[PDB]
Design a protein around this ligand. Structure first.
Ligand code: HEC
Ligand code: HEM
Ligand code: HEM
Ligand SMILES: CCCCCCCCCCS[C@@H]1O[C@H](CO)[C@@H](O[C@H]2O[C@H](CO)[C@@H](O)[C@H](O)[C@H]2O)[C@H](O)[C@H]1O
Ligand SMILES: CCCCCCCCCCS[C@@H]1O[C@H](CO)[C@@H](O[C@H]2O[C@H](CO)[C@@H](O)[C@H](O)[C@H]2O)[C@H](O)[C@H]1O
Ligand SMILES: [C-]#N
Ligand SMILES: [Ca+2]
Ligand SMILES: [Fe+3]
Lengths: 449, 213, 142, 225
């Protein structure tokens, strides 16, 4: 189908933004140990919101790209509107680049005045730092986009894959609406903040990721659509049965009742299961491939996504999800460790996985690229992925020492925040080194095209 | 090492007035100079760091300024408790170094010393020693010269002086001067004289006695 | 074991836990007046929340252990900086003196905040420190 | 409240060693450099060095590399300084003080709290009680409206002595001067001024205590004749 071509601008832009994300990561990582680096021009918080918003935005672009590509094929017809897909692309790209520039070009409080935050105050919450007009512009893009892809499903064949993807996509946009709700009571603000972050990343985004995985396995493996889609329903069932009460693992210390200590701990303890099932899923249906596939990189991307999502979300998630432990590790370099591995292993990797399947047959080159291009992609895969495990090991060691020095001893014996950070210095230099190897990976990956 | 010289070493002033004092570094210390207040019976108190940053809890009547090589401290309207010793310290480099201080003193009206002379006590004499003591009490300002004369001749050796600090109640100074002789050397002379010379008078205050009288 | 079976486990699981979740959030939301001490949630604390947001303090600091990990936990800072009595006064100094300019050290910005703004901040943080947080953090260092 | 309590006065002989302590309270002992500073009389503060109790590292002014050794014991929140091969030049007050900022890399900063200081007195002298001599006005010079009396305290070691007039009830118009060294031993004097109808009609007695030799002596001031 020809309207599958509108996915290309989405995947390209996403990869450009991904580069920006890594550079601002590297700036912050240096700021950790040379604390006045780039100060006062780009204070760490400005660098941080660039890093974290570039991550959310580029992943969103990959998702829309992924939907624009596979929805036509599933639905067995042309996309409701290519000209819509392109108008939305430039609106979203300009709105993204605009809000990022606001962050860098005006002190935050000035950007707040300037965008009239005081009428509808939604700014200065983590991951949600974009002006209210930027948020509004994202909702409008998401409505367009959902109509575009949702109409295509309507007049076309329904499949479980495409309907789980749409459910996830709709859920994402809906939950995003809670970013407009900024209570005056701090505990209430935190309580609802997690309906965005947690119900995205351990709920609705898992429908998106799983749908993308299932499609790639349908196309790569020649295994029956019926069995693939069964396991897809099992996986997302386990996602939401663990995940919804699971939100509670963020409700231990924000000021809500202590029953959340139990509820949060017990259901979160089970949230690894879907990522475990996604590894049994990808490995088994690639093992059972009725046919070989010219692009052997995608198969690697799909196996690796599921192992990394499982290591990052499942294993690191679990290591700190029990309240008696989280009590000590809350808000610590351990959190940063888990968060890096989980966002990379689940979400960055699934976007690169669908790029690996779709890029050749979108630039009209074929199923796969020449064999030089394919060895690079794999190098960029191992370099990024291995670097990230090291990023997470070095931060995990930092987090363990932080907990020991700062969190465990009593008053008088416990080391101050600032002093314990000097003690962590080596681990932060080493992470910054790993961060360099990762960029070299992203560049190597990018030189595959 | 960077060397610090504070000026002036002593400054007299009054309540309600403003003073400013100096600190110089022998090479650039960028902006990193701190100041401490020193007072008897109290631990040293950080006033200012980084040239001009006031330490938490310090009243805004204190302020400082400078960079590189030249720095100042100002107090806007002196308060009774501000009369004290002030030290600066450079905090740009290893090894840390300090200035030697400016002592800020309470001005009061000039007063001449009250002078008294005391012959050796008979108890000290029976042990073979002879100390002649002179007190110069309750004077202002602090500069003062004491001179011993034996039978009209200036005597320089065997004289120890001690000086009180500014009295916290009346703001004057006091001093003792003790001429220590052997009984034998004491007995060779008759006339013992203590003379104080002080700005309150172009002529000395002379006190004396004759060993046999 | 069929597809249809799996899809109904998904359907029933998600509705039931969605409804369990909403019911818990109804309950939880009833307890918040006492837990957070909303009685004390003054116009001053609510204005402080706005200055916390407008200057993105959370982009460098944690509050109740959430936010960024560059700078210290501010939920309980009030207890490390002269308590109830003198904390407002500390904070005024603290905001004026930034950046401290210590070479190589993590640096905090100068926000050129008015005195009212900083006072509202201080109330917000004081009040935040008193939320019943199930005894988090472990000690006075946050 | 951040506080630093230093140990008491130590006396030592030349070539010996001395070790003093600084007890920290009201803060995270392991999170701040503890500095040590020397002050000899009318001589200007000198930074000796510092210890970071969070990892036991030390830093010494090159002028004190030989002299000083710094340590910390973290269970007790106390830092220690040992001075060796003592010399008269090591006779001083020695202060500990806390970096105003936390962390390892702020080695060269200013200090926000100081100890009250530990005096080290280096001498070969022997514990000796003073002699105390009354000082009565010149023979027959009972003349003006007020009269000055004195007390001389001679030949003692170590500091201090405490001196009072009429067991302390006579306290105004008193000047008690700092002690000075004559050779190895200390001498001081005190004057008291009083109206001439106060005396010699009423009794004036000098009281001198020297705790180090457990001496208390009284000297009545008697008119000369
Ligand atoms: C990053 C660019 C920061 C932003 C934005 C804010 N703070 Fe900050 N803060 C930061 C650092 C690196 C430090 C450490 C200071 C040091 O040198 O030790 C701080 C410190 C504070 C503190 C003191 C905390 C303590 O435990 O003693 C407070 C109270 C504080 N900062 C408040 C605060 C507020 C209210 C902010 C938003 C207006 C804010 N900070 C932003 C880094 C950053
Ligand atoms: C891919 C799925 C997920 C991703 C992207 C992810 C990401 C992250 C990130 C970024 C944070 C820090 C958020 C903050 O800014 O407060 C965080 C926190 C946390 N995650 Fe996840 N996570 C995922 C899955 C999980 C899993 C499956 C679990 C449980 C097994 C888990 C348990 C935790 C808990 C307990 C914390 C809070 C840590 C703290 O208290 O400091 N997460 N996660
Ligand atoms: C060179 C590579 C990277 C560097 C050096 C880096 C650095 C950092 C730093 C320093 C923080 C701020 C932590 C703090 O608040 O103190 C951060 C936040 C974050 N980064 Fe990265 N980053 C890099 C790559 C990545 C990648 C590839 C991802 C995608 C997974 C990622 C996801 C995140 C997340 C989710 C946040 C918020 C974490 C949280 O709040 O708990 N980063 N990053
Ligand atoms: C499978 C595990 C599921 C467990 C679910 C239920 C968990 C509830 C248990 C309490 S959570 C939290 O734990 C803390 C102790 O770890 C408790 O801390 C206790 O000790 C601390 C000293 O270490 C001290 O700082 C606190 O004041 C003291 O209350 C804390 O209150 C509690 O809420
Ligand atoms: C991947 C895992 C990450 C590592 C972090 C997990 C660490 C959680 C296990 C906590 S053991 C816990 O340590 C507590 C704190 O020292 C200890 O606290 C106790 O002693 C305190 C003095 O230290 C004192 O405040 C109290 O008397 C008391 O609560 C406690 O015994 C111990 O269970
Ligand atoms: C995790 N969120
Ligand atoms: Ca965070
Ligand atoms: Fe979560």
């Amino acid at each position: 189908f020809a309207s599958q071509a509108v996915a290309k601008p989405y995947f390209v832009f996403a990869l450009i933004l991904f580069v920006g994300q890594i550079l601002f990561g590297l700036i912050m990582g240096l700021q950790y140990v040379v604390g006045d680096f780039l100060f006062p021009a780009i204070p760490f918080n400005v660098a941080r919101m660039v890093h974290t918003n570039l991550l959310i935005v580029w992943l969103l672009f990959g998702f829309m790209g992924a939907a624009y590509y596979l929805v036509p094929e599933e639905s067995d017809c042309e996309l409701y509107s290519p000209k819509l897909a392109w108008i939305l692309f430039w609106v979203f790209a300009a709105a993204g680049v605009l809000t990022i520039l606001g962050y860098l070009l005006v002190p935050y409080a000035g950007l707040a005045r300037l965008t009239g935050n005081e009428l509808w105050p939604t700014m200065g919450r983590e991951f949600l730092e974009q002006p209210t007009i930027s948020k509004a512009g994202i909702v409008i893009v998401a409505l367009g986009f959902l109509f575009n892809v949702g109409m295509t499903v309507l007049r076309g064949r329904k499949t479980a894959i495409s309907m789980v993807l749409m459910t996830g996509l709709i859920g994402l946009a809906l939950l995003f609406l809670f970013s407009f709700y900024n209570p005056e009571n701090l505990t209430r603000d935190k309580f609802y903040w997690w309906w965005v972050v947690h119900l995205w990343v351990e709920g609705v985004w898992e429908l998106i990721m799983g749908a993308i995985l299932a499609f790639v396995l349908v196309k790569i493996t020649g295994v029956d659509r019926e069995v693939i889609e069964k396991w897809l329903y099992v996986i997302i069932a386990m996602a939401l049965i663990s995940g919804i009460i699971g939100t509670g693992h963020h409700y231990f210390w924000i000021g809500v009742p202590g029953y959340w200590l139990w509820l949060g701990s017990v259901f979160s303890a089970l949230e690894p299961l879907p990522f475990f099932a996604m590894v049994l899923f990808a490995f088994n249906t690639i093992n059972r491939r009725r046919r070989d596939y010219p692009n052997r990189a995608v198969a690697l991307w799909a196996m690796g996504t599921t192992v990394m999502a499982f290591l990052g979300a499942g294993v690191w998630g679990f290591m700190h999800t029990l309240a008696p432990v989280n009590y000590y590790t809350h808000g610590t370099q351990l959190t940063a460790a888990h968060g890096h591995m989980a966002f990379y292993g689940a979400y960055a990797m699934i976007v690169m996985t669908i790029i690996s399947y779709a890029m050749p047959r979108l630039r009209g080159i074929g199923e796969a690229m020449d064999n030089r291009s394919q060895v690079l992609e794999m190098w960029g895969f191992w370099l990024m992925t291995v670097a990230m495990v090291f990023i997470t090991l070095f931060l995990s060691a930092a987090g363990v020492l932080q907990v020991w020095l700062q969190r465990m001893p009593a008053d008088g014996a416990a080391m101050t925040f600032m002093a314990t950070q000097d003690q962590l210095a080596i681990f932060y230099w080493l992470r910054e080194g790993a961060g360099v190897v990762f960029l070299i990976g992203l560049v190597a990956y990018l030189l595959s095209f | 090492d960077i060397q610090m010289t504070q000026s002036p070493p002593y400054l007299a002033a009054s309540p309600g007035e403003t003073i400013t004092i100096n600190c110089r570094a022998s090479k650039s210390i960028r902006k990193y100079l701190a100041w401490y207040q020193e007072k008897p019976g109290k631990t040293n108190k950080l006033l200012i760091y980084s040239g001009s940053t006031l330490q938490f809890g310090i009243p805004s009547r204190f302020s400082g300024s400078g960079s590189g090589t030249e720095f100042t401290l100002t107090i806007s309207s002196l308060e009774p408790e501000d009369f004290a010793m002030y030290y600066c310290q450079q905090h740009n480099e290893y090894p840390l170094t300090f200035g030697a201080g400016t002592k800020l003193e309470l001005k009061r009206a000039d007063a001449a010393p009250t002078v008294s002379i005391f012959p050796p006590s008979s108890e000290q004499l029976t042990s073979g020693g002879a100390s002649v003591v002179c007190f110069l009490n309750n004077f202002y300002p602090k500069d003062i010269n004491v001179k011993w004369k034996i039978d009209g001749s200036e005597r320089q050796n065997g004289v120890l002086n001690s000086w009180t600090d500014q009295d916290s109640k009346d703001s004057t100074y006091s001093m003792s001067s003790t001429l220590t002789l052997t009984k034998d050397e004491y007995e060779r002379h008759n006339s013992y004289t203590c003379e104080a010379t002080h700005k309150t008078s172009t002529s000395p205050i002379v006190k004396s006695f004759n060993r046999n009288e | 074991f069929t597809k249809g079976m799996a899809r109904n486990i998904y359907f029933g699981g998600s509705v039931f836990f969605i409804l369990l979740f909403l019911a818990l959030t109804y309950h939880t939301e009833k307890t918040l007046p006492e837990r957070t001490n909303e009685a004390a949630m003054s116009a001053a604390v609510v204005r402080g929340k706005l200055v916390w947001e407008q200057n993105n303090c959370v982009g460098c600091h944690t509050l109740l252990g959430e936010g960024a990990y560059f700078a210290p936990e501010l939920g309980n800072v009030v207890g490390r900086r002269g308590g109830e009595e003198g904390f407002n006064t500390f904070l005024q100094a603290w905001m004026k003196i930034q950046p401290l300019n210590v070479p190589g050290r993590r640096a905090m910005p100068q926000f050129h905040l008015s005195e009212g703004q900083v006072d509202d901040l201080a109330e917000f943080l004081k009040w935040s420190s008193k939320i019943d947080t199930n005894q988090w953090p472990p000690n006075k260092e946050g | 409240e951040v506080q630093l309590q230093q140990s008491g006065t130590v006396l030592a002989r030349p070539g010996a060693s001395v070790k003093m302590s600084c007890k920290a309270s009201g803060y995270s002992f392991t999170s701040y450099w503890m500095h040590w500073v020397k002050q000899r009389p009318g001589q200007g503060l000198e930074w000796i060095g510092a210890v970071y109790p969070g990892n036991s590292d030390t830093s010494y002014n090159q002028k004190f590399k030989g002299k000083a050794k710094l340590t910390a014991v973290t269970s007790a929140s106390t830092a220690y300084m040992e001075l060796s091969s003592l010399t008269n030049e090591d006779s001083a007050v020695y202060y500990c003080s806390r970096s105003s900022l936390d962390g390892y890399y702020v080695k060269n900063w200013c200090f926000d709290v100081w100890g009250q200081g530990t005096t080290v007195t280096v001498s070969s002298a022997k514990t000796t009680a003073p002699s105390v001599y009354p000082l009565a006005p010149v023979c027959g010079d009972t003349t003006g409206s007020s009269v000055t009396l004195g007390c001389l305290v001679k030949g003692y070691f170590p500091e201090p002595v405490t001196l009072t007039w009429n067991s302390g009830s006579l306290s105004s118009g008193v000047h008690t001067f700092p002690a000075v060294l004559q050779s190895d031993l200390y001498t001081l004097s005190s004057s008291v001024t009083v109206t001439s109808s106060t005396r010699p009609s009423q009794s004036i007695t000098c009281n001198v205590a020297h705790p180090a030799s457990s001496t208390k002596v009284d000297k009545k001031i008697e008119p000369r004749g």
